[PDB]
Structure 1
Amino acid sequence: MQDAITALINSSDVQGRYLDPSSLDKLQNYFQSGDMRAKTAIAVSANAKNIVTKTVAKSLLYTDITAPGGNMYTCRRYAACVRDLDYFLRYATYAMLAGDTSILDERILNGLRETYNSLGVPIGATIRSVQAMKEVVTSLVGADAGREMGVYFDHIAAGL
């Protein structure tokens, strides 16, 4: 787990120098965006269930993976897919609030490929679901907040 402040402090500390104006500028941008980042974190926390519902409806329902023989067949696997989508949304919110992708690399992508490949979860359908979730979040929290959330959504999608 590492946030933007930790990254900048470490980059300055490796060379043993104070915070140069470029690092101060990056920290200032992070701090100033913090207000809208917290606002959209509140919105996502309030509408997580709706976001996941819309995402599943527009990316996974009425496809082959829901019909018998698909990976979303049976209630247990449907619930597991919905839970994975909730995980992705929550950890994307974490990464947005931290201003860094370290949390995603540490607690999402570390073992995600192994899990999905051992269990037979289709990667492409999950990527499409993450894209649909990014679109829904963007439409819900606005343009700029949606874009800065979509950065971490795309980080998760590219990790897969």
Structure 2
Amino acid sequence: MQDAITSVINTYDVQGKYFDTSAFDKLKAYYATGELRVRAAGTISANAATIIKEASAKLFSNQPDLVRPGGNAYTTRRYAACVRDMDYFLRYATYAMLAGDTSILDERVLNGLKETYNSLGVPISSTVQGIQAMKEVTGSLVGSGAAKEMGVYFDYLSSGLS
């Protein structure tokens, strides 16, 4: 995977350049947000089960057909797979927020996910709605700045699915 620092390093390595002022500015921008990212990741980890429960409640309230017979979240196994998927999304969004870069979302989550969901009959729009529900709950839990930061990676996930 790639973080913000490795992203900058790679952009300068492909050009064979030593760091200039702008690179050091970008690195300072990343180092300046490190304490905020760490506090956000700790808070999210402490309350991840609560976030998943609240966001799944919101998703299934807005779309009750999902958990009724015929819906893709109707069986104990499909409901479990759905909430497990949401737990994965929250965890990897935390990984990317801590890394300051969306590369891990591509590498381990989004690559092949839309094809997988199409091949399984998983509704894409409903999964995007669940991601938005996690966005809302997580933001309420982590506060303004950390919420704006986690929003970037939640939106990256939603865009990758949409």
TM-score, normalised by the number of residues in structure 1: 0.97
Q: CA RMSD in A?
A: 0.9
The within-5 A match list for 1:86-101 is 86-101=87-102
For the pair 1:56 / 2:82, whether they are aligned, the reply is no
Equivalent residue letter for 2:131? V
For the pair 1:152 / 2:150, whether they are aligned, the reply is no
Equivalent residue letter for 2:140? S
Counterparts of 1:125 and 1:17 in 2: how far apart (Å)?
45
- Secondary structure at the residue paired with 1:158? helix
State, as a whole percentage, how many aligned pairs show the same letter: 64
Match of 1:44 in 2: 44
Match of 1:129 in 2: 130
Counterparts of 2:11 and 2:108 in 1: how far apart (Å)?
23
Counterparts of 2:87 and 2:39 in 1: how far apart (Å)?
19
Shift of 1:18: 1.4
Shift of 1:15: 1.8
- Secondary structure at the residue paired with 1:59? helix
Counterparts of 2:96 and 2:44 in 1: how far apart (Å)?
13
TM-score, normalised by the number of residues in structure 2: 0.96
Task: Output one character per residue of 1:42-93: Cα deviation in whole Å (capped at 9) or x when no partner.
Answer: 0111111000111011122461111111011011100000000000000000
For the pair 1:32 / 2:32, whether they are aligned, the reply is yes
| Contact 1:60–1:125 (8 Å) recurs in 2 | no
Counterparts of 1:60 and 1:125 in 2: how far apart (Å)?
9
| Contact 1:95–1:104 (8 Å) recurs in 2 | yes
| Contact 1:5–1:27 (8 Å) recurs in 2 | yes
Shift of 1:10: 1.2
Shift of 1:135: 0.6
Runs (5+) with no aligned partner, structure 1: none
Counterparts of 2:28 and 2:14 in 1: how far apart (Å)?
21
Equivalent residue letter for 1:74? T
- Secondary structure at the residue paired with 1:60? helix
- Secondary structure at the residue paired with 2:110? coil
Shift of 1:19: 1.0
